[PDB]
Symmetry: C2
């Protein structure tokens, strides 16, 4: 009937907007899992931010591969790797060295503010990470040689993993 034909669309509206839109409450729990993993990675000082995009001080943003743009802290040692030269968009720099001056703060919404310095051979930097609460989505701002905030990496904060990483 016409009646059964329309009853099998109105029950489909109660299924498409319920089961296939349950990937918002489940994705929230997934983001919660990644959050706790990011918190614990920061606490244990063994983490990497895998950059999805990079924003320069001239306002340029570029989407990016996380294999060649990352920020890593592991075993008291820290790496800043980017594919740009002096943190300008227009083979870059590897700021590797000792991690010092670590502070970790948390707001009322569980957003985490993780700050530290890197003592390198050629260049030094202060690093500022903001982790979004209930997610592993994080922003890393890098200030090289006290010159000013120059480069921001936006991406995913994960535990350091001998496997994936390098």
């Amino acid at each position: 009937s016409l009646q059964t034909r329309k009853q099998r669309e109105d029950a489909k509206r109660e299924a498409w907007k319920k089961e296939r839109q349950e990937k918002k409450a489940l994705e929230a729990q997934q983001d919660s899992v990644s959050y706790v993993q990011a918190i614990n990675a920061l606490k244990n000082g063994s983490f990497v931010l895998e950059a999805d995009n990079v924003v320069f001080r001239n306002g340029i943003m570029r989407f990016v591969s996380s294999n060649t743009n990352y920020v890593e802290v592991n075993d008291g040692q820290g790496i800043i790797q980017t594919a740009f030269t002096n943190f300008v968009y227009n083979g870059g720099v590897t700021v590797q060295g000792n991690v010092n001056g670590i502070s970790m703060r948390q707001d009322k919404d569980g957003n985490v503010y993780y700050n530290y310095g890197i003592n390198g051979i050629a260049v030094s930097a202060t690093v500022s990470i903001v982790l979004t609460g209930g997610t592993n989505q994080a922003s890393v701002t890098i200030n090289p040689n006290f010159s000013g905030n120059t480069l921001t990496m936006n991406g995913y904060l994960v535990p350091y993993n001998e496997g994936h990483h390098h």
Copy 2:
């Protein structure tokens, strides 16, 4: 040599699509008819959040503009800013990056907007200053012609 030579060719095909998208972006900004669909949003307090491009965007068409975001008062923890587009500046640097600025004047609401388009691509960053507050919000994503998005 085996795997890492075919992957270099598929990079160059993407680098040709990027250049095509750049000309389309540049014409869209010039015509005052464009949309930037946000992939992620960066807030004043340094929070960034990856978002859906249908609930976070900027569009300008036919002398009118809208800023739509899912976040109340432009803070992470949903505003609509609609109005008339005025004071347009469009400049290019030597590397071909485009700097597109304008204001939005609406009903008891205003915003200034700064767009940086990355040369050779359609990747762009849009920075929003609502009601002279400096409670800034930046949207990062892709800038397309208004009818394409």
